[PDB]
């Protein structure tokens, strides 16, 4: 009666956490389900081993969740992983005590669809960005494979694409860079995403109310697999809240509700120095209270303070001393959960988008890479739930000097609109916050999508 589902996440703690948190929710929906997660180098990364031991030692998480290590072999290619995944699947399938429900693959692990076919088990995808991203990528793939479109024609173009999962035309300049740059990079991502429509179903880390038009579009394509919006899946205990910082919380406690603008871009130092200067000037002109997570600049000075001074306007740190703080790493989810935080200047990565939404904090969009430009366009132009600093900003690597720097006047104006006490954007975020929390409760859309997914997995095995 037991049905076992094998998950294969892509490497990286972020994708692993979102995969395991998703697995935990699925296990709640049917006692017959068990989940096995195949991990790459379990006993090589501490944060991974600690997390997996934390999960399996806690009986608040069921004994129907387990991990199996994929050790990097002395000769390690994809075929080595293919062979190594083949061997584990053959072992699991020999077990008469449980039925193998299939493989659930990350969007970057779709090559393992061949292994599922070989062992005659269904394949599925856990897509960790949103439905609009999923639909846009399938559209670009169909353009290339079914209509002989040269995707490089869209790079920096002014045309607007008619994309079925967006109700408004999509500017070519918000397309993910990897899909319009040609060469090996286009090949790589075409091979990832063209197999997604060949699985038996796609879990998406979104909720129906956020992206209803895209999901209706995706569900209407009789040639595409069923999609299951099972999110928001967040990297913390969504019933208890995230773990924070005492020092930050103490400072935030001293600020009025919704008065602080949080600026965080992963603390990677992605911006060039001239862009940092413009953000700093905009913060000062705005007069707003702020918390700015900024990677320490490597300017060759002795002290950390001096290194920040090298890239900020002269005297910036002294003049803003009483209204804001420039710091390094910050616990993002915990900061957004604080009632003093009223706005979020963000690169619009999907996890950051869901976390801000979850805590009802509106964003101003400063996308940088991957699908962040599209996420910004979704939030600003399709949903009307964010302020725009820029939609099409793009960096190719950390710190790359940009030919078009966003000026302080444009940033200032966006921050003033963001922090205005009454705004349609703010109201729409609050309405979306309630829907995000309701989606995961019994009777919620995402709760039901999780039940339907487990139900379909059990029945698809026959």
CA dihedral (190, 191, 192, 197) in degrees, to 10, reads: 90
User: Which residues 6+ apart lie within 8 Å of 282 measured at CB?
Assistant: 408, 409, 410, 411, 412, 415
Are both 272 and 412 inside the same structural domain?
A: yes
Could you tell me which residues are beta bridge partners of residue 326? 292
Decide: 6 and 102 in contact? Cβ < 8 Å.
yes
CATH number for the domain harbouring residue 362: 3.40.50.2000
Are both 22 and 77 inside the same structural domain?
A: yes
What's the number of domains the chain is made of? 2
For residue 114, the enclosing domain spans 3-237+441-460
Q: What are the structure tokens assigned to 167, written together? A: 């109700």
Q: Give the integer Cα–Cα distance in Å for 460 and 462.
A: 5
Are both 189 and 223 inside the same structural domain?
A: yes
Are both 301 and 410 inside the same structural domain?
A: yes
Decide: 376 and 359 in contact? Cβ < 8 Å.
no
**Coil/strand/helix, residue 285:** helix
Are both 220 and 252 inside the same structural domain?
A: no
Q: Give the integer Cα–Cα distance in Å for 363 and 418.
A: 7
Q: ω before 125 within 30° of 0 (cis)?
A: no
Q: Other CB atoms closer than 10 Å to residue 296's CB: what's the count?
A: 17
Are both 26 and 171 inside the same structural domain?
A: yes
Are both 253 and 176 inside the same structural domain?
A: no
> Which helix (H) or strand (E) segment is 409 a member of?
helix 408-419
Are both 173 and 276 inside the same structural domain?
A: no
Taking Cα atoms as reference points, which of 142, 149, 117, 154 lies closest to residue 218? 142
> Which helix (H) or strand (E) segment is 186 a member of?
helix 183-193
Decide: 160 and 172 in contact? Cβ < 8 Å.
yes
Decide: 399 and 390 in contact? Cβ < 8 Å.
no
Are both 153 and 296 inside the same structural domain?
A: no
DSSP 101: E
Q: Give the integer Cα–Cα distance in Å for 85 and 93.
A: 12
Burial class (CB in 10 A: 0-12, 13-18, 19+), 133: buried
Are both 32 and 178 inside the same structural domain?
A: yes
Are both 176 and 37 inside the same structural domain?
A: yes
Are both 255 and 220 inside the same structural domain?
A: no
For 386, what's the count of Cα atoms within 13 Å in the CB-facing half-sphere?
Answer: 30
């Amino acid at each position: 009666t037991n049905v076992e589902l094998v998950f294969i996440p892509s490497p990286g703690l972020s994708h692993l956490v979102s995969t395991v948190e998703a697995a935990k929710l699925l296990l709640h929906r049917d006692h017959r389900l068990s989940i096995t997660v195949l991990i790459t180098n379990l006993h090589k990364d501490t944060k991974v081993e600690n997390y997996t031991l934390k999960t399996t030692s806690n009986p608040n998480t069921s004994p129907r969740l387990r991990f199996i290590n994929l050790p990097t072999q002395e000769e390690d290619s994809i075929d080595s992983q293919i062979r190594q995944v083949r061997e584990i699947v053959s072992v699991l399938i020999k077990n008469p005590d449980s039925k193998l429900g299939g493989l659930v693959l990350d969007m970057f692990c779709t090559s393992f669809i061949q292994v599922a076919e070989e062992f005659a088990i269904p394949s599925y995808v856990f897509f960790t960005s949103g439905a609009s991203a999923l639909g846009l990528l399938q559209h670009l793939v169909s353009l290339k494979l079914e209509h002989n479109q040269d995707l490089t024609q869209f790079k920096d173009s002014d045309v607007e694409l008619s994309v079925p999962c967006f109700s408004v035309p999509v500017p070519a300049k918000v397309l993910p860079a990897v899909m319009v740059e040609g060469g090996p990079i286009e090949d790589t991502f075409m091979n990832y995403f063209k197999r997604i429509p060949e699985t038996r179903g796609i879990m998406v880390n979104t909720f129906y109310e956020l992206e209803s038009f895209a999901i209706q579009s995706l569900l209407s394509d009789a040639k595409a697999p069923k999609v299951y919006p099972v999110g928001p899946i967040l990297g913390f205990d969504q019933t208890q809240g995230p773990v924070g910082d005492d020092a930050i919380k103490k400072w935030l406690d001293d600020q009025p509700e919704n008065s602080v603008v949080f600026l965080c871009f992963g603390t990677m130092g992605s911006f060039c120095e001239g862009q940092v200067k413009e953000i700093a000037m905009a913060l000062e002109k705005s007069g707003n209270r702020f918390l700015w997570s900024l990677r320490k600049p490597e300017k060759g000075r002795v002290t950390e303070y001096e290194n920040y001074e090298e890239v900020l306007p002269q005297g910036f740190l002294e003049r803003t001393k009483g209204v804001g703080k420039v710091m390094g790493w910050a616990p993002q989810a915990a900061v957004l959960s604080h009632p003093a935080v009223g706005g979020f200047v963000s690169h619009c990565g999907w996890n950051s988008t869901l976390e801000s939404l979850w805590f009802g904090v509106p964003m101003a969009t400063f996308p940088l890479y991957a699908e962040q430009q599209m996420n910004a366009f979704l939030l600003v132009k399709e949903e009307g739930m964010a302020e725009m600093i820029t939609l099409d900003y793009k960096i190719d690597f950390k710190g790359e000097k940009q030919p078009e720097i966003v000026g302080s006047d444009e940033i200032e104006a966006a921050i003033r609109r963001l922090m205005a006490e009454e705004s349609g954007v703010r109201r729409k975020v609050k309405e979306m916050q309630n829907k995000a929390r309701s989606a995961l409760l019994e009777g919620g859309s995402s709760y039901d999508a999780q039940c339907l997914f487990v139900h379909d997995v059990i029945n698809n095995i026959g």
